[PDB]
Design a protein around this nucleic acid. Structure first.
Lengths: 226, 176, 44, 382, 232, 140, 174
RNA sequence: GUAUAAGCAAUUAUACAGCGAAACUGCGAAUGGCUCAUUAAAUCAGUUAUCGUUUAUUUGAUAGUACCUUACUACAUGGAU
RNA sequence: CUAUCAACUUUCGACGGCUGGGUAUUGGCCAGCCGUGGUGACAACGGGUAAGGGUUAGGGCUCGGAGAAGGAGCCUGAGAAACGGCUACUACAUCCAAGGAAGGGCAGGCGCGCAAAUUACCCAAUCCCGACACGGGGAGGUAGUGACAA
């Protein structure tokens, strides 16, 4: 039963081969999401606690959160559920999955370190993995960087450097096109919008007044006929 | 502010009391901004009316929440159906002793005001303003709704109502 | 007649409704106790 | 999954959390739009798609115990769940809101239901054999099994002959409507339509023993219980003048004691030979009681009461004391226990059809094994 | 995707446009009473040759119908819609003839500036304002209060303003837009009510030929006053 | 049954009767004007309007609740005989309690929205004659 | 199963025709909705043209018009008392169109005592029919439902008054 | 409409800019056509009506709706994939 | 076309009216309530299966139910009960490490052991569908065979 160990804070992960079901025995009959200490696992794992988040048993079936059958079971998955992507829209498909009950017939267990211990897993917690992309919209950049009102996200955005082809040319920077950034063109867009509103209401006021004097004119002519 | 309302109501429910205990679902459903009219009409004239035993324990928090939902400008649409029908609904469903405690909540500084003395006028009162005119507009619309829904039950509340509305009218005509 | 839409019991055999279930006799009593009890109800 | 009382804990493992839930559309908009953080550990459901989004009417469990059939009201359907596969097997629509359904086979392979448009519908896996309209409106359903015959009680008084009242009984090896059994309901207005009057004129409940002698018991709206003997096809007894309408009727495992109930909310446990009530309990408030069944915690015998005040009361029989009371927080329209032990599947008004687990009554059934470990975890957490 | 023969026989196609024929798109004019823009360009005017050529011409802002640029190929332009082409600077108008076929006329800007449209109906719009429905599916808000059903309106085509109106009148000259006597310019002499549906007018020519056409098909052009330049 | 009513006229006020004319050169009868009878399928009391075809005929079976059966006779040309042949057609029309029904009379009916499987017409003006039974034949 | 086509019925002359075709989509008629009293349960149904109509299955409150004086109020619904179609519906407490039902009187009495002044149900313009006064003294009025609860999603109707009021009292006593 | 492809191709004031795979978003597939027990004024054809209904797309116009006790305030909006 | 079809309907309500439900809407279309019908020797009803209209010298031209292995239910969408999908039953068939997984039509050849018209090319023009001048089209044209004739 190999364990896919993931440190979500540091953003790292590693598969670990595990023999000795006598060592693994504390995992049995534990639901997905249950907190379990790693002190029974290894002497390096002193002071750690980890949650489980699923896995795959033999014959390769996923493990869906929220099913109490310990064996392999046969659900009917709709669109927005796990362990299924819809082929077409509005599709409900019957698929077989393994219930949340961690039994002996599993093959990989997805485990996530939530509180570390005093010792360090060598390939897991020492290695940091950054986030791939920084924030793009202006307000989220502002919340990320704690900037003031005068502090210019245009010059405080994240930059990334690459090298192009052409036999080692100059390095080349890249910037993520800040979305929620107010520009004079946005200002003129809103201004032209309300200008269209007031111009239309001005037009209907003018035409209503002219129809008022034309109806007074035609009623006066009809009464002069009468 | 509806978020501050939610946190405040969570604090009042942290005050674990047998009076508030059977009504916490009605409180949170009054507070959820998609259930207001239905939660109101299930609160009043429903099977689970306010029991008169701990009514003196539940009515103040319920009335402050009703004032918050009648003062809210965020979720309101326009027109009379925008917030005016809401105030009319709250005052129509309210009760008269509850209305007295509510107008005590509504008149902030003007609760203990005296417009007339043993002598005629109190120019020392009128040449000092305790309220901004925006709050005066809100108070006065609120009280017009209160009177229009009250009718003849105004009798135990005159000595506050006439003081409030006369102070507003005379400060207005002095501003004229 | 006032009764067409099922309002009178048309005692007519139904083709599909003919042979659904066989009678399975499930009674734990030897029927002598039961009809002696039907004799010795409240009335006797 | 929660725990309501102290002494004998009840566990609502599946069921609605709120009394007035919003539209499911607005709930989905909120869940996919705003930030949420739910109690992901103890929040789940045990059977996928155990709801109907409007209300529910009736649940039964098969004799084999592998099939759960349950009807719901909008796009009026019945779902069938293969409880070994822990999911929805299929879901079939109908033309009106189901009143009462009864299974025939040990599996779901044949079902029947009395259905609101005065109909009896017969369902196979292959489809739906043609319905038969009954003349007068229905109230419940029973099936003589030793001699296959489905019989329905009806409201109002008969057309011609006498003015007693009727239980339409049609056989399945014969096919025809044999004869309505003549059961007196009460006096009606002579100026009236053929479908009775609005105040009274109703037969309500039928119940038949399937292992003992099987006295066909009927219950009528003037508070009057009658008893018909099969193989004789005639009236045997009339007893029990009560103040409430007779709405509760079920026999015991031995075949002697009856437990019937009055819509004021009063249960009387009778013997078939002693006209004095063996036990009497008035309970709850004036809301009418709905259902009652005997059941044995395998040492001791106990009794269910189901009434729409969100009240289900498990009473004792050998003593009469109240063992446990449960408040289902919403309306409820039907109750059933699994034949194993411990779990009460309850059909309600809310979206989610809710089941209770009593650890002190029995174990978790043979298809949710880990429910015992879940109550175990609740005792860990508390 | 009808055949060339099953296409209406008054927007003409010769014996070489293939077995098919375009169908008009959805627009103001009716299906049977339409001339599509590609057929107007390459079959009647022959300012192009091919579907792709007409696609390119209509794709660049070069063909203007009723004062507005039209992009798509099969925009319907049925009846009395001015077609301004600026690179030739010509304006074309669609009338019928005595036989009942589309006839194109060349006009300059002075008479090309305005349109003459028949009033379909009149009602009160939202807000309590009277509005006016032409047969061009044009809605004019705030009209002259005398313009009833089956009137005719001279329309500015630049501001859409009601420049003038002509009244349904016995003793007026008209043009027919339907029926078995379609396209016979003559004078209205008589109206017959026949209350209960399908009122008739009796319309003779300028040269002593009487016939019965229905008001729906009748299209008032002017008492004498041929406000549009009919072909001579 | 419930209480019958015209759809939107306020009765119990402490401070009328609406009836519209069909037009087409028709006059509402006085029993339709003042008679307190009420029915939804009457063109002068209900909301049913008459438009389209206007037909005539002779009633044959007045013994029915406010619906008559009309025999429509006409002359059918068969080419094989090159002769005209009599053909009777059986219509129906909703009869108002405003008029005085007579069997054998001449009745003018008008096309309305379909009120029943057969009832497609409303009666407008009866003309009283001395029409006889089935044995009478005439084109009308 | 449910449809609106007329192929299965007999001819106008009393003939049976095969006329065997398939049930298409525009003769679709959906299943009925027994609108009962409970918390608000409304299922949305999209129909042709993408219109929305609100099938109301469980309803508690609706509004009722006391428009004789010119007011209307949203009140609760206790339970049906009579129905012209089905006594089974009267039994099962269903709300349809033209359904007479006793409603709560408290907002109406509130509006009355607020507007005119005199207490009711405990000058010359504030006057009540005595039967309506008895309804107010009991505190449970007789109103009618005239909104279609199935195809509009709301129970609204006018209060009963005068001739219809006395007619329905007599019908209730029948 | 959404590009930080760790994609190319560049500089003369550096959020983004040219081209742009993948992906999200919007549209589209009420047919082009195949088979076979047939439909005997019900379909169908003329002839009307919709004051008994629906309609994406088309083109035309189109929407006056603030303040209303947060104030000892708020003023570059959120969260997900 | 027929009386070797004179009675038919009420045997899925047959004709009404009232009340509602559902439908986009009217409607016995359906649920209650009551009334008594409605059709027919002027040819109902049944039976037979052999299932035309318009464009007018002419011929030509144009237009014209049920199912996608079988019942049953559901889903999107302005428009479908799409057969496009799913769900359960039934009838088949395939892969496998025997735990499991996906799937169902048309065209061609033989149909004696002895026989005879292409498995062709392109959307080039007319026409259609799309964010859209550029993408995609099983209508359309181009080509090849022929002593059956002519």
């Amino acid at each position: 039963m190999k364990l896919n160990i993931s440190h979500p804070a540091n953003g790292s992960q590693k598969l670990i081969e595990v023999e000795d079901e006598r060592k693994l025995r504390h995992f049995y009959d534990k639901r997905m999401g249950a907190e379990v200490a790693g002190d029974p696992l290894g002497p390096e794992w002193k002071g750690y606690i980890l949650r489980i988040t699923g896995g795959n048993d033999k014959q390769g079936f996923p493990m869906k959160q929220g099913v109490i059958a310990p064996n392999r079971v046969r659900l009917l998955l709709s669109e927005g559920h796990s362990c299924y992507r819809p082929r077409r829209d509005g599709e409900r498909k019957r698929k077989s999955v393994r219930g949340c009950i961690v039994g002996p017939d599993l093959s990989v267990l997805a485990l996530s370190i939530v509180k570390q211990g005093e010792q360090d897993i060598p390939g897991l917690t020492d290695v940091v993995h950054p986030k791939r992309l920084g924030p793009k919209r202006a307000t989220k950049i502002r919340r990320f960087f704690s900037l003031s009102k005068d502090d210019d996200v245009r010059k405080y955005v994240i930059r990334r450097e690459v090298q192009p082809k052409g036999e080692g040319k100059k390095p080349y920077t890249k910037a993520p096109r800040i979305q929620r950034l107010v520009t004079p063109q946005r200002l003129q867009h809103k201004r032209h919008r309300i200008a269209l509103k007031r111009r239309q209401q001005e037009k209907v006021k003018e035409e209503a007044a002219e129809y008022a004097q034309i109806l007074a004119k035609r009623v006066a002519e009809a009464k002069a006929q009468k | 502010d509806i978020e501050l309302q939610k946190l405040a109501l969570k604090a009042i429910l942290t005050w674990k009391s047998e009076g508030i205990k059977p009504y916490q679902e009605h409180l949170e459903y009054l507070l959820d901004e998609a259930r207001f009219k239905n939660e109101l009409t299930v609160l009043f004239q429903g099977d689970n009316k306010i029991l008169p035993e701990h009514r003196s324990e539940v009515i103040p928090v319920l009335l402050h929440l009703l004032y918050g939902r009648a003062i809210s400008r965020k979720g309101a649409a326009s027109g009379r159906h925008g917030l005016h029908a809401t105030r009319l609904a709250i005052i129509r469903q309210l009760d008269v002793e509850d209305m007295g405690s509510f107008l005590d909540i509504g008149l902030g500084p003007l609760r203990a005001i005296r417009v007339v003395d043993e002598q005629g006028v109190r120019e020392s009162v009128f040449a000092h303003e305790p309220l901004p005119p925006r709050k005066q507009v809100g108070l006065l619309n609120m009280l017009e709704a209160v009177i229009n829904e009250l009718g003849t039950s105004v009798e135990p509340y005159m000595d506050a109502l006439v003081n409030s509305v006369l102070y507003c009218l005379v400060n207005a005509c002095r501003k004229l | 007649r006032r009764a067409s839409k099922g309002r009178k019991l048309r005692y007519t055999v139904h083709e599909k409704l003919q042979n659904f279930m066989a009678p399975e006799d499930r009674r734990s009593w030897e029927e002598h106790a039961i009809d002696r009890l039907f004799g010795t109800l409240f009335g006797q | 999954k929660l725990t309501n009382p102290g002494p004998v804990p009840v566990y609502t493992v599946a069921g609605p959390s709120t009394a007035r839930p919003l539209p499911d559309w607005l709930l989905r908009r909120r869940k996919r739009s705003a930030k949420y953080d739910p109690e992901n550990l103890n929040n789940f459901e045990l059977i996928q798609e155990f709801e109907f989004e409007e209300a529910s009417n009736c649940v039964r469990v098969s004799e084999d115990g592998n099939w759960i059939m349950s009807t719901g009201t909008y796009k009026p359907q019945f779902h069938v769940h293969n409880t070994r596969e822990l999911s929805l097997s299929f879901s079939r629509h109908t033309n009106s809101e189901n009143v009462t359904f009864l299974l025939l086979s040990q599996d779901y392979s044949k079902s029947v239901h009395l259905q609101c448009d005065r109909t009896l519908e017969f369902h196979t896996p292959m489809g739906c054999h043609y319905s038969i309209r009954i003349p007068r409106f229905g109230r419940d359903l029973a099936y003589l099994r030793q001699s296959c015959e489905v019989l329905v009680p009806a409201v109002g008084l008969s057309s011609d002959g006498s003015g007693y009242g009727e239980v339409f009984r049609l056989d399945l090896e014969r096919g025809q409507f044999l004869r309505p059994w003549q059961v007196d309901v009460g006096e009606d207005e002579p100026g009236s339509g053929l479908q009775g009057s609005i105040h009274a004129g109703a037969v309500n409940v039928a119940a038949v023993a399937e292992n003992t002698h099987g006295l066909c018991a009927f219950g009528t709206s003037i508070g009057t219980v009658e008893f018909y003997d099969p193989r004789s096809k005639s009236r045997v007894a009339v007893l029990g003048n009560q103040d409430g309408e007779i709405t509760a009727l079920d026999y015991s495992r031995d075949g002697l004691s009856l437990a019937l109930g009055t819509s004021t909310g009063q249960i009387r446990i009778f013997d078939l030979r002693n006209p004095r009530p063996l036990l009497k309990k008035d309970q709850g408030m004036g809301l009418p009681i709905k259902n009652l069944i005997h059941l044995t915690t395998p040492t001791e015998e106990r009794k269910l009461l189901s009434a729409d005040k969100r009240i289900i009361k498990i009473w004792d029989e050998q003593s009469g004391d109240l063992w446990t009371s449960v408040e289902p927080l919403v309306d409820l329209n039907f109750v059933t226990h699994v034949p194993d032990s411990g779990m009460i599947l309850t059909a309600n008004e809310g979206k989610q059809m809710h089941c209770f687990f009593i650890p002190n009554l029995g174990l978790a059934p043979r298809w949710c094994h880990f429910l015992d470990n879940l109550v175990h975890e609740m005792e860990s957490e508390k | 995707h009808q055949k060339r023969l099953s296409a209406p026989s008054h927007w003409l196609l010769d014996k070489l446009s293939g077995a098919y024929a375009p169908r008009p798109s959805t627009g103001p004019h009716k299906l049977r009473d339409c001339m599509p823009l590609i057929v107007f360009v390459r079959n009647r005017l022959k300012y192009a040759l091919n579907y792709r050529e007409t696609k390119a011409i209509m794709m660049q802002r070069l063909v203007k119908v009723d004062g507005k640029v039209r992009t798509d190929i099969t925009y319907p332009a049925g009846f009395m819609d001015v077609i301004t082409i600026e690179k030739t600077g010509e304006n074309f108008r669609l009338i019928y003839d005595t036989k009942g076929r589309f006839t194109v006329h060349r006009i300059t800007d002075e008479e090309a500036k305005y349109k003459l449209g028949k009033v379909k109906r009149v009602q009160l719009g939202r807000g309590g304002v009277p509005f006016l429905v032409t047969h061009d599916a044009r809605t004019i808000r705030y009209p002259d209060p005398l313009i009833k059903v089956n009137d005719t309106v001279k329309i500015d085509l630049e501001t859409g303003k009601i420049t003038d109106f002509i009244k349904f009148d016995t003793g007026a000259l008209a043009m027919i837009t339907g029926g078995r006597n379609m396209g016979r310019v003559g004078v209205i002499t008589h109206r017959e009510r026949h209350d209960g549906g399908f009122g008739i007018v009796h319309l003779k020519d300028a040269l002593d030929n009487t016939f019965a056409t229905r008001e729906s098909n009748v299209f008032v052009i002017g008492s004498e006053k041929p406000w549009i330049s009919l072909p001579k | 049954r419930a209480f019958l009513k015209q759809p939107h006229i306020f009765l119990n006020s402490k401070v009328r009767r609406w009836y519209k004319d069909v037009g087409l050169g028709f006059k509402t009868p006085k029993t339709a004007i003042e008679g307190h009878y009420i029915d939804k399928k009457c063109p002068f009391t209900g909301m049913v309007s008459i438009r389209g075809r206007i037909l005539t005929g002779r009633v044959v079976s007045t013994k029915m609740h406010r619906t008559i059966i009309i025999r429509r006779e006409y002359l059918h040309y068969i080419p094989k005989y090159n002769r005209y042949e009599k053909r009777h057609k059986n219509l129906a029309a909703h009869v108002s309690p405003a008029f005085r029904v007579e069997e054998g009379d001449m009745v003018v009916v008008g096309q309305c929205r379909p009120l029943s499987k057969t009832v497609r017409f409303n009666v407008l003006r009866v003309l009283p004659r001395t029409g006889k039974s089935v044995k009478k034949f005439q084109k009308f | 199963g449910i449809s609106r086509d007329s192929r299965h019925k007999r001819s106008h002359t009393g003939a049976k025709r095969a006329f065997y075709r398939k049930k298409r989509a525009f003769e679709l008629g959906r299943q009925p909705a027994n609108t009962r009293i409970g918390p608000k349960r409304i299922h949305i149904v999209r129909t042709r043209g993408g219109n929305h109509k609100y099938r109301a299955l469980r309803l508690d409150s609706g509004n009722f018009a006391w428009g004789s004086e010119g007011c209307t109020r949203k009140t609760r619904i206790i339970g049906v008392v009579y129905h012209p179609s089905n006594n089974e519906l009267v039994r099962t407490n269903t709300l349809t169109k033209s359904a007479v039902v006793q409603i709560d009187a408290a907002p109406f009495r509130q509006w009355y005592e607020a507007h005119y002044g005199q207490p009711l149900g405990r000058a010359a313009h504030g006057k009540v029919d005595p039967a309506l006064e008895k309804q107010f003294e009991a505190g449970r009025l007789y109103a009618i439902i005239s909104s279609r609860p199935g195809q509009s999603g709301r129970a609204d109707g006018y209060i009963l008054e005068g001739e219809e009021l006395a007619f329905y009292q007599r019908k209730l006593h029948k």
